[PDB]
Ligand binder design. Sequence first.
Ligand SMILES: *[C@@H]1O[C@H](CO)[C@@H](O[C@@H]2O[C@H](CO)[C@@H](O[C@@H]3O[C@H](CO)[C@@H](O)[C@H](O)[C@@H]3O)[C@H](O)[C@H]2NC(C)=O)[C@H](O)[C@H]1NC(C)=O
Lengths: 545, 556
Amino acid sequence: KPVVNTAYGRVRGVRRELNNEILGPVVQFLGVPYATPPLGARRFQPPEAPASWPGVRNATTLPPACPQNLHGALPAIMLPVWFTDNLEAAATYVQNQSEDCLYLNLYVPTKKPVMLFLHGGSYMEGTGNMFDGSVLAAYGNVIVVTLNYRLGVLGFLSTGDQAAKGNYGLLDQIQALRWLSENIAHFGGDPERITIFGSGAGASCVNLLILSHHSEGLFQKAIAQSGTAISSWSVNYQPLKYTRLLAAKVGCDREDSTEAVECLRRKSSRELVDQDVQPARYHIAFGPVVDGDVVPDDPEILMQQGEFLNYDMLIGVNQGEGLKFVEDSAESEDGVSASAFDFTVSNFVDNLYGYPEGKDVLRETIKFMYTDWADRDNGEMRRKTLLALFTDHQWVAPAVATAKLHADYQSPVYFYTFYHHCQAEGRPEWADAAHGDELPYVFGVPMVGATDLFPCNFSKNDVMLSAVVMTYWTNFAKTGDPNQPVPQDTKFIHTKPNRFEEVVWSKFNSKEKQYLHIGLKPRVRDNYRANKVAFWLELVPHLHN
Amino acid sequence: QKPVVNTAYGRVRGVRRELNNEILGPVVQFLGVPYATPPLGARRFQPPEAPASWPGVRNATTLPPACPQNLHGALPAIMLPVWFTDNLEAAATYVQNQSEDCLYLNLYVPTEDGPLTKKDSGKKPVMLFLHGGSYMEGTGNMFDGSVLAAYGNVIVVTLNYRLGVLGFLSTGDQAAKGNYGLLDQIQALRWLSENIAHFGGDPERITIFGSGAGASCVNLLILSHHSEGLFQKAIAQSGTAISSWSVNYQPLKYTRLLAAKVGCDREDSTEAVECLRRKSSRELVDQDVQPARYHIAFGPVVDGDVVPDDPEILMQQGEFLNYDMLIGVNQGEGLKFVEDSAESEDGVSASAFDFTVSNFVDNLYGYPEGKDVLRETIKFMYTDWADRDNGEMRRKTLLALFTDHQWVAPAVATAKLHADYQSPVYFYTFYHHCQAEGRPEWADAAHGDELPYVFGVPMVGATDLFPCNFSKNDVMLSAVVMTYWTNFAKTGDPNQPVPQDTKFIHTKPNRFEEVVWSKFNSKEKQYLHIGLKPRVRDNYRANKVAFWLELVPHLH
Ligand SMILES: *[C@@H]1O[C@H](CO)[C@@H](O[C@@H]2O[C@H](CO)[C@@H](O[C@@H]3O[C@H](CO)[C@@H](O)[C@H](O)[C@@H]3O)[C@H](O)[C@H]2NC(C)=O)[C@H](O)[C@H]1NC(C)=O
């Protein structure tokens, strides 16, 4: 239980032996502060330095979660599938929760790299306590850092201008990054190799922070897993509409904008969060905002403007992310009918577009792009294309658009496609890697049993691939190149053909656009979902005017 | 030996000819027997009438004249079969002696049961061949149907029908309803149906077969009120009644421009036509009145008579009797499309591509307001997004664009309609050309490249318009296509009587003896893929077909 010198005082940890031989000992520094508790006047405002404690600290204990309501106001399309599948177990990590939750975890193995994991799923739920970064830290020989940041209703509320600028949850994350860039050295890690990695909403932040001038020499490498800043549910373009309703429900609905927020300074957080103010399908009620400050402009304008540092990037998507989209089709058998098809695709255009000629054309033309024709009477293979309609539109299209944009400014990008998943009954046979199914592998869960969340029988291959992705990820934190240093050796556990042995993960550039197909039989292919992307990226634009 | 079949108009005497092959038997030829009164007087722009009954013995000995055309001018080259334009020189030699008086067919009567061992009379199928590239040129005289007849044991018959101005000038009035050529083919049909049995033909098994323009006529005749008890099987090769150039919906427009040129343009339409009669067949045909791009100036017309409606409606409506079908397209029809920049040897410029696509939606569509969307979303379709780089790909797909639009899409559409109204349809796809001197080695099989095989050219050696090296391999494939076609005019089902057998060429396993060729229904669109490695697939060009047939009506 060692103590360590930080610029605000000293903290205690816990050495804990892993039951696995390949995994070493780790020191866990759970629940260290990075910003003074944002209560009262410190609410709805940017975080600063934390308390300076004169003595020591007992940081051997998990911090509380941020004010959130898991039962009700469910944005179930957005969330990682393992979340909604096991809401039961999910609620466990968010019981002890206070408005004081600006806290940081550190998983240290004993000038190492640092991997800051930005959790989430909707901007509104979640906690860093969810993901035990012990196994990642101990296998990759890297410092893994989970965190907590204010959540949506309380962390992302905004008025049309000044009274509430918004994005307090994002600022909470760069103040956990200001703390890392000054103090991680003392834990045994190089502060010039901090990498920020996230999935879903978490990845939307990774990608936003890149574009934010509020973080420059704070991190130098980024990993976006299944999420971007140009996605439909990325940034809140309607923050006034949803702030009004929230204020209207508690009684803080003043005509004056700046007096309404001062009312909101007074009402209890337990009450302030649990309101049931929900967004329009596929959008966010509370999240990131174009404020002209932390996020200077629309992420898309910002990207082409190209005023961001050339971070080392690792972007990717899963095969069938949008499982949730074709959920009402669990008891179908005949799959989805054309009647059900024409319907679903119609109010997909409705919910994401709405303007004339497109209204009729765009809807009919994309229908054509997602029917097979070679076999068009088959419901079960209409189901798949419906799933990939969403998947393509929400994750694939935006990721390749992103990877392409940064690669053009000579920021090195490595594109991954995750095609493998654990079965986990209560699941279709056609499932094949839904949104957020990559996490258990990135966090080496298949090594240390099956946790509360991911319960399924991890076969010896699930264990193998878990390592494979870990060495890839962790390599990237060091070099900014997943291939090196540690070669793809898996014969530590099973001397069976380590199937990623001699495959080289080539850089993803613009013209040629190579990616890594992560799965059972891995490859480097050249153009992922080539024409279905180009559809959304090139053609669909012209079908508005 | 010169036999003398006695017809219903006189007695005709034809030369016997020994064919240039060991295994092929002799064939009696009846050349230039008349099927109508010559359409000469106030008989121009009139339907053909039965021929004059002669008392003597007629000499079906020499080839007939060809109907008046001008092979050195009117250049719908885009719709002409590539073998024709490639050999204008040699092709012209066949129309060297023209006459307004030209209405004759030629017969090719076999003598054997097909191929031989080197070592009661039944009635034979008749296969009428509708020739023609643009409705303006040609003569059945170009196709020496002796081989086919002798190999397949069918009487192959070719004819001449009025082309161009003389065959198709219409006013849309009672003055000149037009469609004469078609009526000619029908008059030949009437002649065959009545007399062919005298030659030992089976009038119950007359089959018409065309290619390109002639294949349109095939389709038009299937749809025409006039064809009834005459024929009963149709083979449509690379031709269709619904292509941008199968029917002319602007007859008067071009009749007026023509009349204007010979000083016959009156306001009254009877007065204008009755004027044109007074002009020589020669001054009238070699005149230069060119049509809008990918259309015909003089051709078939919707006239409520021999073409009761717009063919596409007649089909949708099921306004046609049940005929056995054989419809097909060749892998790379519109090779002449990418000619404008074809042998540049770095492909076609992307910057040129979007231009050649915009001219496309202009010529065929542009109207234009929905042109905007339509053009941009036919670009996206024909751009391979794997490599938006190599122009070789862009050139291949620019060809494909044209191939799909002009030839395959309407063919698959005609297939789907007759099938659904329940005529049996056999769908073929031709993926093989003989390499003719002086054309690209990206030269997949172009438009009209099927002919040599159908007529068994590779069996008796190269000719002057089919002048390529025919391999032992090219011989087999012809034996295969002929023994399909003939097995069709025989039983309406290409895999009936005679089996697939090319053991008269060395024992390279006969690829086609494995394959049973399924009828084409509109749901599971099964087609035989004719080529070096045949197989039976379903849904040829699924996407691109559906693109033009489902999506594109919805895009304007
Ligand atoms: C249709 O063709 C026949 C021939 O196939 C033409 O009639 C033919 O006339 C010639 C001579 O007038 C005959 O040739 C023979 O010549 C030899 C040698 O000099 C002589 O010894 C024979 O006695 C005979 O004359 C030929 O046999 C004869 N054929 C007939 C009808 O018996 C006829 O001219 C052609 N019809 C037309 C359109 O004129």
